[PDB]
């Protein structure tokens, strides 16, 4: 039952100290690494099962290859992702034909349309305005505090 | 790993100390950088407190300051000619603080020409304002005819990733010239 | 006999600020019948081992045991 290692290039199985961003291992703790025995990259009789990806269609279709197909389980979620999917350009008001789903559960079937992220919204525009105005307000407050303190210094320096 | 503790390193009476407190991470040392010349390669080390150090390996350019006209041009380090701590560092051209190196001197000559207009080594009257009092020295300009300026490293390449320094001048330069005309 | 007493300004504040065990004693909202502590801890330990939802493991042991 040992999986294959993408680039080991051996016909047997060997132990590697596996890390976060590698196959055959899921770290149970931040920073964890484990020495697990993985199987090499070159196929041989030892393999109980191979894993192949169809990249070319030659002749009569297999009955589980093109006839029966699955839909894409989830539509895009980000605003620009829906734009890039359905082809509509920037100024097209993309909140309308978001793919939905009807739930035949209790004869009410209230569609669960996904929330969209990064959407240009007046709430986010108000947040941006609030931040970019807080910055200038703070800068003006600091400038006037410094000015009045300089006034105090140039007043208390007049005593000689 | 390497430990900077004093629980080893037997006491001043000469007594060998008994061991307690297996090595602590707050006492670790690390490997020397041994910065070489050319094809900049800097590695980021994660240090205590989440901070970062930069191990310079194979550094090619350094920021060197004349300190007499205050220019601090960025230039190329040619090689190491003298090191007070280890001649092996000179042999291996290992870049290190306080190493005496040779720098290109071309940016310094270009700045001298754009500033004084006085043909150092081979908006009109700014050269007049920077008046005849422009003679630098009889040892810092004779190196411009060879295009190699003696300099001393001042940063720590293994710590800061940079190989900055200053051009030798005056009695420091005389000292290092004596050392070089002895050991060369 | 000497004890302590509280008088809440309203039954709303009574329900909001009173301990659940004392409300149960009195006769207000009653105990939630949780499993024993050992069983709940063993259960969360058993759920620690499985990674995701579990339906994957369900359909995987749907074929095995037996063939």
């Amino acid at each position: 039952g040992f999986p294959m290692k993408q680039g080991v290039l051996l016909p047997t199985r060997i132990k590697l100290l596996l890390t976060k961003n590698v196959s055959c291992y899921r770290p149970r703790r931040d920073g964890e690494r484990k020495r697990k025995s993985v199987r090499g990259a070159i196929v041989g009789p030892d393999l109980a099962v191979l894993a192949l990806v169809i990249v070319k269609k030659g002749e009569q279709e297999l009955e589980g290859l093109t006839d029966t197909t699955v839909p894409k389980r989830l539509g895009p979620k980000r605003a620009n992702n829906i734009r890039k999917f359905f082809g509509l350009s920037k100024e097209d008001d993309v909140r309308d034909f978001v793919i939905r789903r009807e739930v035949t559960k209790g004869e009410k079937t209230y569609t669960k349309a996904p929330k969209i992220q990064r959407l240009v919204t007046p709430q986010r525009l108000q947040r941006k305005r609030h931040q970019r105005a807080l910055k200038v307000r703070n800068a003006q407050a600091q400038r006037e505090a410094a000015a009045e303190y300089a006034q105090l210094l140039a007043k208390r320096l007049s005593e000689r | 790993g390497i430990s900077r503790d004093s629980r080893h390193k037997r006491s001043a009476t000469g007594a060998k100390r008994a061991q307690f407190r297996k090595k602590r991470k707050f006492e670790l040392g690390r490997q020397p950088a041994n910065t070489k010349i050319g094809a900049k390669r800097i590695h980021s080390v994660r240090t205590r407190g989440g901070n970062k150090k930069y191990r310079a390996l194979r550094i090619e350019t350094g920021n060197f300051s004349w300190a007499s006209e205050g220019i601090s041009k960025k230039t190329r380090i040619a090689g190491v000619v003298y090191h007070p701590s280890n001649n092996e560092l000179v042999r291996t051209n290992t870049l290190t603080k306080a190493a005496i190196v040779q720098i290109d001197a071309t940016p310094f000559r270009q700045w001298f020409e754009a500033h004084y207009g006085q043909t150092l080594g081979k908006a009109e009257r700014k050269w007049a304002a920077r008046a005849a009092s422009a003679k630098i020295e009889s040892s810092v300009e004779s190196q411009f005819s060879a295009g190699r300026l003696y300099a001393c490293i001042s940063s720590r390449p293994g710590q800061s990733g940079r190989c900055d320094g200053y051009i030798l001048e005056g009695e420091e330069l005389a000292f290092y010239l004596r050392r070089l005309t002895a050991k060369k | 006999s000497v004890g302590f007493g509280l008088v809440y300004n309203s039954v709303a504040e009574a329900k909001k600020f009173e301990p659940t065990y004392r409300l149960v004693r009195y006769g207000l909202a009653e105990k939630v019948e949780k499993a024993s502590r050992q069983q709940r801890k063993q259960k969360k330990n058993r759920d620690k081992k499985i990674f995701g939802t579990g339906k994957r493991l369900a359909k995987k042991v749907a074929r095995r045991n037996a063939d």
Binding site: - | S68, P84, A98, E171, R179 | -
Partner: protein, 142 residues
């Protein structure tokens, strides 16, 4: 110190620049400091040519801890002495004392001249060696 430039490196105070462009008077600009606590900076420190980055007056070390007094018992190291610090320790059961001593290695600047004897005052500094945590600040050659 008998050809002060006696090391492999050039000995100099850091960031104390003698500009060869300006035609100053001394041409050997020398930094010093007042150590504090009423220890007078000696004229040897003011006018000498030694470097001693561990000197409490011309070096990079500060006197900020305990001020101790002791008797110099060794001057055989370079810029370092060992001072003897005799005291009496109380033994309560006998209501009496016993003589005890502790040797203390101290860094002595070239500003001072110190021989065996020469009760000295020393001030705590940062650890400047494996065993040295004190700098001579008053020679008091008794």
């Amino acid at each position: 110190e008998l050809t002060v430039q006696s090391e492999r490196a050039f000995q100099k105070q850091p960031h104390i620049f003698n500009n060869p462009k300006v035609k100053t008077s001394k041409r050997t600009k020398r930094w010093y400091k007042n150590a504090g606590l009423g220890f007078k900076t000696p004229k040897t420190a003011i006018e000498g040519s030694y470097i001693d980055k561990k000197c409490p007056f011309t070096g990079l070390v500060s006197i900020r801890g305990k001020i101790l007094t002791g008797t110099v018992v060794s001057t055989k190291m370079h810029r370092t002495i060992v001072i003897r610090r005799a005291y009496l320790h109380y033994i309560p059961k006998y209501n009496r004392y016993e003589k005890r001593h502790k040797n203390v290695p101290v860094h002595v600047s070239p500003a001072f001249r110190v021989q065996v004897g020469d009760i000295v005052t020393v001030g705590q500094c940062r650890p400047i060696s494996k065993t040295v945590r004190f700098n001579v600040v008053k020679v008091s050659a008794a």
